[PDB]
Symmetry: D2
Subunit: 113 residues, 4 copies
């Protein structure tokens, strides 16, 4: 269900595998390594499936000295989607610590818009 | 400086290993209160005295418990004598669509080596 | 521009008057609660949006959730005028539960 | 106890008046650094030991400067020996739509009367 190729509202691509253990492994598209966890035994009451992951924005080509974490839930069904909020923290100095973290929201869908 | 055991002020413990690939792996803590964590950190941070960006996720299920929720911490490691990890976190609970708007708590945590 | 009636997608209604002095005052029909806030009364005219924020404390003469929501965002004019926000909802808790006191979310308002 | 002069950890000062029907009015000083604030609070809180829920907004325009941004603080007042206001805040900047995704900062502030 979660396993697959996902797209956010800005055309970013999220390729993930949901492991049996609760593990999330994949790539965020340059391309970056992602890792996280998900609820591998969600409720049956129609509630969504809790999950999150992290990308540290360093690959072989660039380093932005930052990391984004996504926290959200997968809702399966006809138009499967993953609704997240995210926090993007940059490495800063102490004087600048106050403005190190951005907050936003992303919706992922299995159809590219 | 990241590898090891870190403590928050509410007693919570987190043991991490920071691999050279930028991977973070460990547990967040009695067995029934132990959970798996995984994340990423910047393995080649600036040297201007900036901190080291990182993040990690814990889903609150283990073999004994399932809270149908996941927390992600976004923050930075600041080394020195009072080495610290300053984070902001998001806690999302699985909800019906009806109540999703109230699905996500936000907060902050500071972790120390003691 | 900002002054007028605004709707989100989950059936809530906010009526707001944007004052010359940078004040935002009005009503949020969730029943009805007083709102108050501030906006940039001299934005850039380069296409950027107008920063603004407002607060609703969830008490009126009929009820009280012992909570307050604050909305932070920007107005965007044009054919498809919108106010895009992120919000924080904080409830009164004991300090034992103060770490789970605040929810975060997002809301888009249109002139509908 | 909300009414009076408060300080955050970083040096800024916030002067509030708590009104009888839930209004917050006052000034935030980070004269050229002085800004109007406005907000609301729970004027009839819980008598169970819970704090008092509140929020306020500052738009970063005064007679001398304009940042084209606004901060909202959401939190609660905890009266006591060390009476305090614990908040989380969102700072949004006016951006073009292409930059709209990086328009909002999140952080937290604690205020005391000392």
């Amino acid at each position: 269900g979660i396993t697959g190729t996902w797209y956010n509202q800005l055309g970013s691509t999220f390729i993930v595998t949901a492991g049996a253990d609760g593990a999330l492994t994949g790539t965020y598209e340059s391309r970056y390594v992602l890792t996280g966890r998900y609820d591998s035994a969600p409720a049956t009451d129609g509630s969504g499936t809790a999950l999150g992951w992290t990308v540290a924005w360093k690959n072989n080509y660039r380093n932005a000295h930052s990391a984004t974490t996504w926290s959200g839930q997968y809702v399966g069904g006809a138009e499967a989607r993953i609704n997240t909020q995210w926090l993007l923290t940059s490495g800063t100095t102490e004087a600048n610590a106050a403005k190190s973290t951005l907050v936003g929201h992303d919706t992922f869908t299995k159809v590219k818009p």
